[PDB]
Amino acid sequence: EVETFAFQAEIAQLMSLIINTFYSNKEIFLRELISNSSDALDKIRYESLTDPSKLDSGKELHINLIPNKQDRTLTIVDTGIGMTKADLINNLGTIAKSGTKAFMEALQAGADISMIGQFGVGFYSAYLVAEKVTVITKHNDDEQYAWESSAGGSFTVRTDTGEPMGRGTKVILHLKEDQTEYLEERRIKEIVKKHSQFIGYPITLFVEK
Ligand SMILES: O=C(c1ccco1)N1CCSCC1
């Protein structure tokens, strides 16, 4: 059972801007998603201070980067707080509405796409490099869900029947044909070193077999 939803007009407009604007500095997408992961890990770490049972679904707080040349996917996995169904459908998009509007107003004032994180909508920088983004997530208070969008103005949500995650978020980037450089180990290392050196959680770059 798959539910299809329309993006708010402002968000669909930003996604189309990100997909169709000529902008060569695409590597910043990895910084934005890792920063999103780090924030999610901060959140579950804080909550567990007053309620340690919130870590029963997983004590380890980390980030994994998993390139897959055969599927042409780059997966970013964290064990942060995860998202509920209401987060996926309602809450996060309601917040992203004002940040999207402010980000696009800034881009008219001369700002550039690499500043997207200062507006809280850095996740959409994934569509610099991906034709489709799948998000698998599990929050302690909800079941495991899959969110998915190829832009075009819509996204889907379904309960996920795949491998159970315990807790956290997995962002699967189905990469554009001309963006396979972000599946190379030395490229990913370069980008993490440049942009994410001081993230306060272990970032593990998986090697391909
Ligand atoms: O862009 C959205 C969105 C906008 C409106 C509803 O969801 N999401 C990003 C992936 S995780 C949260 C959902």
UniProtKB/Swiss-Prot annotation:
It is found in: Nucleus; Cytoplasm; Melanosome; Cell membrane. ATP binds at N36, D78, K97, F123. ISGylated. S-nitrosylated; negatively regulates the ATPase activity and the activation of eNOS by HSP90AA1. Residues 1-209 are annotated as: Interaction with NR3C1. The modification N6-acetyllysine is found at K43, K69. Changing G82D: Abolishes ATPase activity. The TPR repeat-binding motif mediates interaction with TPR repeat-containing proteins like the co-chaperone STUB1. Homodimer. Identified in NR3C1/GCR steroid receptor-chaperone complexes formed at least by NR3C1, HSP90AA1 and a variety of proteins containing TPR repeats such as FKBP4, FKBP5, PPID, PPP5C or STIP1. Forms a complex containing HSP90AA1, TSC1 and TSC2; TSC1 is required to recruit TCS2 to the complex. The closed form interacts (via the middle domain and TPR repeat-binding motif) with co-chaperone TSC1 (via C-terminus). Interacts with TOM34. Interacts with TERT; the interaction, together with PTGES3, is required for correct assembly and stabilization of the TERT holoenzyme complex. (Microbial infection) Interacts with herpes simplex virus 1 protein US11; this interaction inhibits TBK1-induced interferon production. Molecular chaperone that promotes the maturation, structural maintenance and proper regulation of specific target proteins involved for instance in cell cycle control and signal transduction. Undergoes a functional cycle that is linked to its ATPase activity which is essential for its chaperone activity. This cycle probably induces conformational changes in the client proteins, thereby causing their activation. Interacts dynamically with various co-chaperones that modulate its substrate recognition, ATPase cycle and chaperone function. Belongs to the heat shock protein 90 family. This is Heat shock protein HSP 90-alpha. The chain holds residues 16 to 224 of 732 of the full protein.
